[PDB]
């Protein structure tokens, strides 16, 4: 099962396709962390066009949706296995002054933490952007990580401003290097916005803290030495000539 891929009142089309010739095919939306709910199914042409593509389309985008999506297929009665696929989230904005591209912050623990528990904790923070339509996904090693991660669906209002945090706990191999991300299904390129305080498009932001910048600075220290060392080693070539 495959799945691909908003101003208030906008419309969009969602896609999900299968190669298993399943006749029982439906949609599923999940309130993140506590609930999952369903959308009606169509068995074939004329009732509720091709058993393969069963697209989903929005009538009017609203900020109250605030959930992720799932499209599922199965044969009727032979086994009962309601097979699932991947998912994606919606974001509907009272735009302009409320929506910003996410600002993402990530930290590193203290020395005594690592000394006394030998196993460090890493945390990423992101300041919210009205409404409460926020996302968060850690990214290490080339994959979204679901093991050993905390998530709280509500961006904690502070006064208004928001912030949300997630924890990634874990070092004998410093080859490990971390990153934090958030997927923002912002406004589409084909909806209005005033170029003053201009428009953030649907975007994914990045935060990294594994020595956060000490390694990078020690690296740049090379060019702070290599070229001049080479120059002093090569200026002697006048005598060679």
């Amino acid at each position: 099962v495959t799945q691909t891929p908003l101003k208030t009142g906008q419309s969009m089309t969602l896609q999900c396709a299968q190669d298993m010739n399943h006749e029982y095919m439906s949609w599923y939306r999940q309130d993140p962390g506590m609930g999952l709910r369903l959308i009606h199914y169509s068995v074939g042409a004329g009732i509720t066009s091709t058993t393969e593509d069963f697209p989903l389309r929005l009538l009017s985008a609203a900020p109250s949706q605030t959930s992720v999506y799932f499209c599922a297929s199965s044969y009727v009665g032979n086994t009962g296995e309601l097979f699932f696929g991947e998912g994606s989230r919606l974001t509907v904005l009272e735009d302009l002054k409320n929506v910003f591209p996410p600002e993402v912050a990530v930290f590193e623990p203290s020395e005594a933490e690592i000394s006394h528990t030998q196993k460090a904790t890493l945390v990423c923070l992101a300041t919210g952007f009205y409404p409460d339509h926020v996302e968060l996904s850690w990214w290490v090693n080339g994959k979204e990580v679901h093991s050993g991660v905390s998530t709280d669906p509500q961006p904690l209002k502070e006064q208004s401003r928001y912030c949300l945090s997630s924890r990634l706990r874990v070092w004998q191999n410093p080859r490990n290097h971390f990153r934090c991300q958030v997927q923002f299904y912002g406004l589409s390129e084909n909806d209005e916005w005033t170029q003053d305080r201009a428009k953030p498009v649907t975007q994914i932001v990045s935060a990294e803290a594994w020595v956060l910048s000490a390694t990078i600075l020690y690296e740049i220290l090379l060019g702070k030495a290599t070229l001049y060392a080479v120059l002093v080693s090569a200026l002697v070539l006048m005598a060679m000539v």
């Binding site: 020395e111 000490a214 020690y218």
Partner: peptide, 16 residues
């Protein structure tokens, strides 16, 4: 969390 130890490496190279 090793940069300190490179620091002692530098001072010890200096005194050496």
């Amino acid at each position: 969390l090793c940069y300190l130890l490179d620091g002692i490496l530098f001072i010890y190279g200096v005194i050496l």
